[PDB]
Swiss-Prot record:
Classified as His(+) endonuclease since it has a histidine upstream of the active site that coordinates the first cation. The lineage of its organism: Viruses, Riboviria, Orthornavirae, Negarnaviricota, Polyploviricotina. This is RNA-directed RNA polymerase L. Zn(2+) binds at C1842, H1947, D1956, H1960. Mg(2+) binds at D1120.
Length: 2008
RNA sequence: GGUAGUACACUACU
RNA sequence: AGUACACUACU
RNA sequence: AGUAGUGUA
């Protein structure tokens, strides 16, 4: 941890050049890690630190009286010992990831100490403390030791040692001897998976083709390699080395040629520019005109928004019946003649209620009351229309189509030519997007929309989002709050809210619409209506009707049918719209999308116009068509390529960009993109980089400058680069998934697949070539690279085969693998004609391969039941299937993604799944070792990897450039020399691969299989036979696609499908070279990595020819490549290098069969983009807008709480990806609004709970009771929706704890709960506490409990609606048929249930046996929810059903009442009322409050830590986020009590045998003991037994299913208790790098409070608590950390800012009276003295005496006499630094000065400076000399306490005169130009005192000339009289900080001028209490306009005038 | 020409 | 209604 | 363990 020791290790690594000493380096590194952990553990435990203390020594120490030689002490050396309570504990520190060494050392030490334990009559305990370096989880075996130490708070980081190990291994990676020397064990191969290999593989036609393709020597080499057995051979790498040596000549020749190409390359690469963009645009428009039908008519446009809107009418009433009457009258009174005017008038007559409004209301109310009285739908009773006036009414807003009221001809005209009901190869018609008239029409449309919608609403901006989240959003960003207020005031919000409400009403009324009825939908607007036409994927037909007084005052986005005159104005009818419920639901959610988009685009940008942003967002948010889809996604490639250094944007536009402009908005956005391309080319040079700050240990202040110089894209303004990237990339997420149509997408996907297959069949005939032919692989280079990479990878780890089998469950059963037991679909081949009934297709097409789709688990059940599969180890069965399954069949379906063209998705059969599983797991485990591979990297860690690569490339650039240009810089401190100096080049190739799986040479994987060392020859033969049979796979065409292709009746021109299928005579097509998408990810990625390694070699050699330095980092996921190249050379310009690098990148991709997408491949100098993730310049960046937009996404629609928890997930992910707090809060508000809208809980609505509960606002109601979340954003991110209860409890603590403990730790504050008075609690608090006590917890719980259930062990759902829903067909499931047979079997259920009781662990864990699996599969069918999931369900239909059933009795209140002490289903409102009634009778007591606190907070260490962070937080100096970084969330529960896996522990507990398969005998015993203790102390077994007994007695018969359910919850709780370290991968973008839990919490809290700036957070006490997950914590930690921080801060502050002489007196004075963090510093000093950590404060102790020479001896042991020390420190006056020897220096570690604000004490008055305020000073404590000398007199005036000082020179004497540090910045001279700033030791003239002197002189001169009221000067007697007047004035009035700072500044000026005597003699002038003339004088004050004091003097005068006027 | 089972949401500062 | 890589919810 | 959702390729 020590930085000097880190430097020492770095020097050892750098200077080392022998692999024999690198082992010494690594061993020393491991010892340093162990000793560091031991020292930190001893500090935490507060025990004296020892290492390898002799056992005889410890025996003598514990028993000095006994004579030595009484017994031979064992030679073992314990790390440390501890003797308390007559028990000796032998402690051993271990820093390992495993327990093998721990257990063997435990056994050895125990055996060797038994004899001494018996003799000396002392029990000896062997305690092994083990820490896991990668996840800091502590493991302790001795429970007695853990009893001694209840809280162990070891919080340390091992990242430094990992970095050194990585540096050593990368330096000596090329040395195979070093790898062998550091290898663990030898090369070991497990037992062969198969006993025999395929003999028919050699006869396979595919193998014959491959063999004939290869030349003869390669055929021989392939046969030898596949027939090679590593275990039999003397060396495993015998054949690998032979092949590598054979191919070395060709490999070296290829590398040398490719390197020689650098000279032949010119400087001209594919630069994007305006000419290329224009030519590409011309080619694109030509291609689009050829492929489409271009229309120049505006009347051919399609609706941009399927809606028309008009402002409301304040004069008219908003009652529903009045609106209906008004609509009927307006429809009837249409004047004029038109096509449908008579139909509209007839409809208005049909809906004419007349004057019988009361009768209509009564009829509708009676119907609704009848409907709502039943949980189920009312059946068998027919609704009969009632005639009211001329209206035949069936329901509210439902009317008959009366044949008498409408002519038949008019009715058919309307229904067919208008609504399309009863209605009934050319090119798709699209508008001309390049036509000037068409673009002018689009501009006119957008201008009209802006004009109509920019006006004010005229109504209150009050709404749910604002009311419930305005405070949070305002505190986060007042500007965001103001933007929201403006948005809600404008008319865009009213229009989109009206459209959403109206569309929800349309969806509600369309469910029960009949064929002869039409519905009327109404919204809050009294002028906007909807008429829903009859309808039967369900569709909705609606027409929007708008009433407006003035014509042309309507908002028409190309949806209007016509505007007609009526009574009292005009009526406008929109054209009929037919939409899918999926698009309708998006429209309903659209307000959230609109608000999110507007706030994202406007955030932190004053140069943008909110009107323009909303004008764009209203169209993108409501876009539900493919027209905008065709533009959003290609825009990324177009604009990003244009900004790039090298890109083929011209070819991209010409060949791929295909705008689909069916709408005027699409035309407008096409023009926007076109302009943005040229602008992006023009403005690529305005990107600038921040000044890098390098500390040589970490990088801070890195990235890209924030200057708004780039032009905005979609709307006028200026943006930063980050905002520009957001504007480029966010629009892709405006698209909607599932917009495609199955018919067309199946046709296109089949066409693409068959076209690729046909092209491969015809054109592609060569497999191996040397000239980089398309779809061809260079054989020699491939083989050589594969050999090299395989050698390196398998040399890295010696047990690769064992690791594969262990991690992939190869040795375990088939039923224990998730991918083989899932509910995903799989293909089944065979005769299934009966189930499928299709008949016509079967008869008409002979060669039809019959197939059916089934679930994976069902297929596994079938194969197990038919004995095709067994429960033997899975790998043996997999290889058996590799031989048996000769024919592979696949089918495909469309993904339905959000891109313009859908993606084909392939489904395979079970045997193919298993074979590919084996191959892919082998490839995966070899990819894990390779650093370049990125699929093996867990998700979201790729951001951290990108950051690390960028940081090391920055460091390499700086170091290499400085090292090379040292000579030139020395010569400078010449222009000709500067010309010839070396320059740095940085290159980022963000690349894409074209047709990764479609066009790939599958033969290159044969070599990967054959050259693999870890496989046996028989395994290789079987796998190669599988691959050969895979290359003969057949694609089964889908039945629906075949149906449509057979129902055409007109022959297609060139039907590729018919050609490939023999004129539709077969449904199967043979696919050979296209390994199917997604099946061979790891293998393809490995070969991609090998290709990039060859590229790296080529680049390194080529740069070697240039005598330069290069660093190449390549990241490869599957087909997405991120290659960054850093070059520092001087021979040639950068253009030649860029051209050469790009040409060789393309050539290297083509060499290995890959093909880079040059259209989508672009080169940048700074920006990295690997997988939707960006690294701007060392600084991580991500588009969190996608997570922000997914806040309104679909959910399970289970209930109000379940729905909310799903969307808070998206909010939290957005927070993790860098979303600012205000936008995160907006997303949370939108999620709450969406849920409340779904369940009709919005304010004022029926299910709104605010009235029924004692709460002022919905923040007071619990989430489970339908409140809104109220908690800090850091809490929401960390604990995740438990934050509601946590925040409520913390607020209760902060409100009711006594003042003495108010600033104590959470455990102490909870211990003080017994003193609470329950009578003082408010009604809301009482209600919430009762809810927590009785609804969340159990009545049996007692405050005396020591262990209890954690919040993760219990659910939170209370009010969940129930639905009467049919299960579905489920006919095709063989397992379901077996389950039905078993159910119909006599009593089979009792046996199956009995088996599940006998093996209860099967309920929660996977079974390890076929019988166990088959029983579980049969059992799951009992649960209704599983069957519902099995049936396909539409989320759109579920959402509408939840809306409709909101008033029906759905809540089962019996279950809720069963929760507390001791009917029919109930509605939401009645449930609220009943819950309040039930809770009224219950009582609450201090005992109950203690139970709540103990069971909610004291259980979880994470909950305790979060509560401590909230209570004890101190917020420091604000600062702008300069350089961000990634940091993963650490583990909050470090202590581990269970070692074994939870499944194994549960299996052992179900039985009583600690000895289980795969379970360590003795290790499982303690886990079983712990689990039994947990069960007994929580009384789970007793509670379950009592519950089942009571239920059995109540029912009268044994409810066996109830017993199963009880066992399920019991084992669920047991599983949650015994769950081990999950170690989730959760990374965060944070202002700084965090290493420990406290650092992470500080960074989270400081980052998630304000949008503008982030704060430094330190904690008053120690936040972390040492405890276990389910054990109560009643012990708080010590204050030693506070003492350490205090005295480190004190020593270093005194050294830095105090003169050498005054330092000791300063220390003594501050020790005597001051206090740190509410703790007296004398007490902290006593803690340090009377403690076992005194070697960290040797200089501090020396200055205060102490030492006693024991500390010096201990320090020497860590590596010196007292008098020698005293003599040596004669010249040194440093409090923090002392010299024990002539060169040895004992020092105290530094602490950040931001914590100095925690010191409180009496003033330290010396000279005129009061040092207390200096410690409290914020500006003047900075270490940099420049920053100190450049501070202001406003800050400096705080330190002035003169009381009669004459000279500032003697006043400032009490300041440090040692040299300070200053930041010197230098340029780098690289193609991306940037400056690095590094602090360096300054010379003598720059000291703290000198900086203060310069500050004083400059600022006082400025202030003097600012306040020379008289012309003579500052010292003139008249000016002095004016100063006397002003000081008397300010003394006479109330003190203000303006007055104080002005007084201090004038005082310091007078001290400089030596006017102090009169200053202290200032009094009221004799000419002056005439307040009138004081006012006259101050109003006559000649205030100057000097800029710093201009605002200051005016404010001071104004405040004085206001105060003196308020006085009178 | 005839036929076309199918119980309910919003109801608002507008 | 697929492979993989995750994350978060509910039972 | 099952189910749902989201992001990624
Ligand atoms: Mg890419
Ligand atoms: Zn003074």
């Amino acid at each position: 941890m020590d930085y000097q020791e880190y430097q020492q290790f770095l020097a050892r690594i750098n200077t080392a050049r022998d692999a024999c000493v690198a082992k010494d380096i690594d061993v020393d590194l491991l010892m340093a890690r162990k000793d560091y952990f031991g020292r930190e553990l001893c500090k935490s435990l507060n025990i004296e630190y020892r290492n390898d203390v002799p056992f005889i020594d410890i025996i003598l120490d514990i028993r000095p009286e006994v004579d030595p030689l009484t017994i031979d002490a064992p030679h073992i050396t314990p790390d440390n010992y501890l003797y308390i309570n007559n028990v000796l504990y032998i402690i051993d520190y271990k820093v390992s990831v495993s327990n093998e060494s721990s257990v063997i050392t435990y056994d050895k030490y125990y055996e060797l100490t038994r004899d001494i334990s018996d003799r000396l009559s002392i029990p000896i305990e062997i305690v092994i403390i083990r820490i896991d370096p990668v996840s800091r989880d502590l493991h302790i075996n001795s429970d007695r030791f853990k009893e001694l130490y209840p809280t162990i708070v070891v919080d340390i980081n091992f990242n430094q040692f990992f970095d050194l190990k990585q540096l050593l291994y990368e330096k000596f990676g090329d040395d195979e001897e070093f790898l062998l020397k550091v290898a663990h064990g030898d090369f070991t191969l497990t037992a062969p998976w198969c006993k025999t290999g395929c003999p028919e593989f050699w006869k396979h036609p595919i193998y014959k083709e491959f063999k004939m393709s290869m030349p003869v020597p390669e055929r021989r080499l392939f046969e030898e390699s596949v027939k090679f057995n590593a275990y039999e051979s003397e060396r495993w790498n015998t054949n690998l080395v032979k092949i590598r040596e054979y191919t070395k000549k060709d490999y070296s020749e290829h590398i040398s040629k490719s390197a020689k190409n650098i000279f032949l390359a010119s400087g001209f690469y594919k630069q994007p520019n305006k000419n290329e963009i224009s030519e590409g645009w011309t080619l694109m428009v030509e291609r689009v005109q050829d492929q489409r039908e271009i229309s120049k008519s505006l009347h051919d446009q399609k609706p941009s928004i399927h809606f028309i809107w008009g402002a409301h009418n304040p004069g008219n009433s908003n009652n529903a019946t009045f609106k209906l009457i008004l609509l009927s009258k307006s429809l009837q009174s249409i004047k004029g003649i038109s096509t449908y005017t008579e139909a509209f008038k007839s409809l208005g007559k049909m809906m004419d209620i007349g004057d019988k409004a009361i009768e209509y209301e009564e009829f509708c109310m009676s119907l609704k009351s009848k409907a709502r009285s039943s949980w189920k739908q009312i059946m068998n009773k027919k609704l009969e229309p009632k005639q009211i006036n001329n209206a035949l009414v069936l329901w509210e807003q439902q009317f008959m189509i009366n044949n008498d009221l409408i002519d038949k001809s008019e009715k058919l005209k309307l229904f067919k030519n208008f609504c399309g009901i009863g209605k009934h190869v050319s090119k798709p018609k699209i508008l001309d997007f390049d036509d000037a008239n068409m673009y002018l029409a689009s501009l006119t449309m957008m201008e009209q929309s802006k004009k109509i919608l920019s006006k004010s609403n005229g109504l209150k901006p009050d709404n749910f989002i604002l009311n419930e989240f305005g405070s949070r959003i305002k505190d986060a960003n007042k500007e965001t709050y103001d933007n929201m207020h403006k948005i809600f005031e404008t008319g865009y919000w009213q229009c989109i809210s009206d459209f959403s409400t109206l569309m929800k009403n349309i969806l509600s009324v369309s469910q029960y619409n009949r064929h002869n009825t039409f519905r009327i939908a109404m919204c809050a607007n009294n002028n906007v209506f909807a008429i829903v036409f009859p309808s039967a994927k369900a569709t909705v037909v609606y027409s929007i009707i708008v009433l407006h007084k003035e014509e042309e005052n309507i908002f028409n986005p190309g949806c209007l049918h016509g505007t007609f005159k009526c009574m009292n104005g005009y009526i406008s009818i929109s054209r009929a719209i037919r939409l899918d419920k999926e698009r309708c639901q998006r429209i309903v959610s659209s307000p959230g999308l609109f608000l999110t988009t507007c706030l994202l685009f406007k955030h932190d940008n004053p140069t943008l116009v909110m009107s323009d942003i909303m004008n764009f967002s209203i169209y993108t948010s409501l876009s539900i068509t493919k027209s905008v889809l065709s533009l959003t996604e290609p825009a990324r490639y177009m604009i990003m390529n244009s900004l790039a250094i090298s890109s083929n944007v011209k070819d991209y536009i010409a060949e791929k960009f295909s705008p689909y402009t069916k709408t005027l908005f699409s035309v407008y956005m096409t023009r926007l993109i076109k302009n943005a391309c040229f602008d992006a080319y023009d403005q690529r040079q305005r990107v600038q980089l921040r000044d890098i700050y390098l500390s040589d240990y970490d990088i801070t202040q890195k990235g890209i400058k924030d200057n708004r110089e780039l032009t905005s894209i979609w709307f006028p303004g200026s943006v930063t680069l980050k905002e520009y990237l957001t504007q480029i990339y966010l629009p892709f997420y405006f698209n909607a998934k599932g917009l495609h149509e199955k018919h067309h997408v199946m046709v296109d996907l089949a066409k693409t697949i068959l076209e690729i297959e046909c092209e491969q069949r015809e054109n592609i005939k060569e497999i191996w070539s040397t000239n980089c032919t398309k779809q061809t692989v260079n054989l020699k280079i491939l083989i050589h690279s594969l050999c090299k990479n395989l050698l390196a990878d398998t040399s890295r780890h010696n047990h690769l085969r064992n690791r594969i089998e262990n991690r992939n469950n190869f040795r375990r059963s088939i039923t224990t693998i998730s991918t083989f037991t899932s509910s995903k679909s799989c293909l089944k081949i065979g005769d299934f004609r009966k189930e499928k009934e299709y008949e016509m297709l079967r008869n008409a097409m002979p060669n039809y391969t019959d197939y059916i789709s089934t679930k994976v688990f069902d297929r596994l059940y079938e194969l197990l039941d038919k004995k095709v599969l067994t429960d033997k180890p899975v790998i043996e069965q997999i290889m058996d299937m590799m031989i048996d399954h000769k024919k592979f069949y696949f089918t495909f379906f469309n993904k339905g993604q959000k891109t313009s063209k859908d993606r084909e998705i392939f489904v395979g059969e079970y045997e193919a799944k298993m074979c590919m599983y084996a191959v892919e797991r082998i490839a995966k485990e070899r990819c894990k070792l390779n650093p370049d591979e990125m699929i093996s990297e867990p998700g979201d860690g790729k951001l951290k990897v990108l950051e690390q690569k960028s940081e090391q490339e920055i460091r390499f650039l700086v170091e290499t450039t400085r090292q090379k240009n040292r000579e030139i810089d020395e010569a400078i401190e010449i222009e000709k020399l500067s010309l010839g100096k070396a320059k740095g080049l940085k290159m980022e190739i963000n690349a894409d691969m074209s047709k990764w799986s479609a066009q790939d040479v599958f033969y290159k994987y044969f070599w990967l299989i054959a050259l693999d060392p870890i496989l046996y020859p028989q395994e290789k033969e079987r796998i190669l036979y599988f691959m050969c049979n895979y290359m003969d796979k057949e694609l089964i065409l889908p039945d629906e696609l075949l149906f449509n292709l057979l129902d055409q009746k007109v022959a297609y021109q060139n039907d590729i499908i018919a050609t490939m299928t023999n004129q539709l005579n077969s449904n199967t097509v043979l696919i050979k070279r296209n390994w199917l998408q997604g099946n061979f990810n790891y293998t393809s990625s490995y070969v991609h990595s090998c290709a990039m390694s060859v590229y790296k070699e080529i680049l390194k050699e080529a740069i070697t020819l240039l005598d330069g330095s290069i660093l190449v980092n390549s990241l490869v996921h599957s087909d997405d490549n991120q290659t960054s190249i850093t070059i520092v050379q001087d021979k040639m310009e950068n253009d030649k290098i860029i051209d050469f690098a790009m040409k060789e990148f393309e050539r290297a991709c083509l060499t290995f069969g890959c093909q880079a997408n040059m259209k989508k491949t672009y080169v940048t100098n700074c920006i990295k983009e690997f997988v939707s993730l960006f690294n701007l310049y060392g600084e991580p960046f991500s588009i969190y807008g996608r997570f922000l937009l997914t806040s309104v996404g679909d959910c399970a629609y289970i209930g109000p709480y379940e729905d909310l928890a799903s969307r808070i997930s998206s909010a939290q992910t957005a927070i993790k990806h860098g979303c600012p707090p205000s936008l995160a809060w907006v997303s949370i508000a939108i999620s709450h609004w969406m849920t409340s809208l779904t369940y009709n809980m919005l304010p004022g609505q029926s299910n709104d709970p605010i009235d029924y509960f004692p709460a002022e606002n919905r923040k007071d109601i619990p989430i489970e009771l339908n409140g809104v979340l109220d908690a800090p954003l850091s809490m929401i991110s960390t604990v995740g929706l438990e934050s509601g209860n946590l925040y409520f409890l913390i607020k209760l603590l902060s409100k009711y704890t006594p003042v003495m403990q108010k600033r104590e730790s959470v455990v102490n504050q909870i211990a003080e709960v017994k003193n609470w008075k329950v009578e003082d609690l408010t009604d809301n608090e009482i209600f919430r506490l009762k809810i927590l006590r009785y609804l969340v917890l159990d009545a049996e719980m007692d405050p005396s409990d020591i262990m209890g259930e954690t919040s993760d062990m219990r659910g939170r759902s209370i009010l969940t609606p129930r639905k009467f829903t049919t299960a579905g067909s489920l006919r095709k499931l063989y397992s379901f048929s077996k389950y039905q047979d078993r159910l119909s079997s006599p009593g089979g259920m009792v046996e199956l249930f009995t088996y599940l009781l006998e093996k209860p662990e099967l309920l929660v864990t996977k079974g390890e046996d076929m019988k166990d699996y088959m029983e579980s599969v049969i059992f799951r069918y009992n649960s209704k929810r599983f069957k519902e999931s099995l049936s396909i369900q539409n989320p759109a239909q579920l959402f509408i059903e939840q809306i409709l059933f909101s008033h029906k009795p759905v809540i089962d209140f019996s279950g809720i009442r069963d929760k507390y002490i001791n009917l029919g289903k109930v509605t939401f409102t009645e449930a609220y009322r009943l819950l309040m009634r039930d809770l009224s009778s219950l009582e609450l007591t201090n005992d109950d409050i203690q139970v709540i606190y103990s069971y909610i907070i004291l259980n979880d260490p994470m909950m305790i830590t979060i509560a401590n962070t909230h209570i004890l937080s101190i917020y420091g100096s604000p600062q702008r986020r300069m350089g961000m970084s990634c940091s993963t969330m650490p583990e909050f529960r470090n202590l581990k009590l269970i070692h074994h896996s939870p499944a194994l522990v549960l299996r052992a507990y179900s039985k009583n045998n600690p000895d289980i398969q795969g379970a360590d005998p003795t290790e499982m015993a303690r886990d079983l003991v712990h689990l039994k203790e947990f069960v007994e102390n929580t009384n789970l077994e007793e509670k379950m037994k009592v519950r089942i007994a009571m239920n059995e007695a109540e029912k009268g018969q044994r409810d066996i299913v109830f017993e199963l359910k009880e066992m399920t919850r019991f084992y669920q709780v047991c599983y949650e208790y015994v769950k081990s370290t999950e170690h989730k991968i959760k990374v965060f973008i944070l202002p700084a790098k965090s290493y420990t839990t406290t650092d992470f919490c500080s960074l989270m809290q400081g980052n998630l409070i304000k949008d503008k700036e982030w704060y430094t957070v330190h904690y008053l006490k120690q936040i972390l608590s040492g405890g276990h997950k389910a054990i109560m914590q009643h012990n708080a930690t010590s204050e030693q950390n506070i003492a350490f921080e205090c005295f480190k801060l004190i020593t270093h502050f005194a050294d830095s800012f105090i003169d050498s002489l005054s330092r000791s007196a300063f220390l003594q004075l501050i020790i005597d009276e001051f206090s740190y963090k509410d703790v007296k510093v004398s007490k902290l000093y006593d803690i340090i003295k009377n403690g076992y950590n005194r070697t960290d404060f040797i200089p501090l102790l020396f200055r205060t005496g102490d030492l006693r020479q024991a500390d010096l001896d201990k320090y020497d042991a860590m590596k010196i006499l007292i008098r020698s020390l005293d003599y040596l420190n004669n010249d040194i006056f440093s409090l923090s630094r002392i010299k024990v020897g002539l060169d040895e220096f004992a020092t105290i570690k530094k602490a950040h000065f931001s914590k100095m604000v925690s010191f409180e004490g009496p003033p330290i008055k010396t000279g005129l400076l009061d040092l207390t305020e200096l410690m409290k000073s914020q500006d003047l404590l900075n270490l940099n000399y420049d920053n100190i000398r450049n501070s202001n007199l406003i800050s400096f005036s705080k330190l002035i306490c003169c009381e009669g000082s004459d000279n500032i020179n003697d006043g400032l004497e009490f300041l440090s005169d040692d040299p300070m540090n200053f930041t010197e910045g230098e340029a780098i001279h690289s193609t991306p130009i940037f400056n690095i700033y590094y602090s360096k030791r300054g010379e003598r003239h720059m000291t703290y005192r000198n900086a203060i002197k310069l500050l004083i002189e400059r600022e006082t001169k400025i202030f003097e000339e600012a306040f020379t009221f008289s012309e003579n000067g500052f010292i003139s007697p008249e000016n002095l009289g004016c100063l006397e007047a002003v000081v008397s004035l300010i003394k006479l009035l109330k003190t203000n900080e303006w007055s104080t700072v002005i007084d201090k500044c004038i005082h310091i000026c007078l001290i400089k001028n030596g006017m102090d005597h009169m200053y202290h003699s200032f009094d009221v002038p004799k000419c002056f209490i005439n307040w009138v003339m004081f006012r006259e004088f101050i109003n006559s004050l000649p205030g100057t306009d000097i800029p710093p004091w201009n605002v200051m003097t005016e404010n001071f005068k104004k405040k004085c005038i206001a105060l003196i006027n308020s006085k009178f």
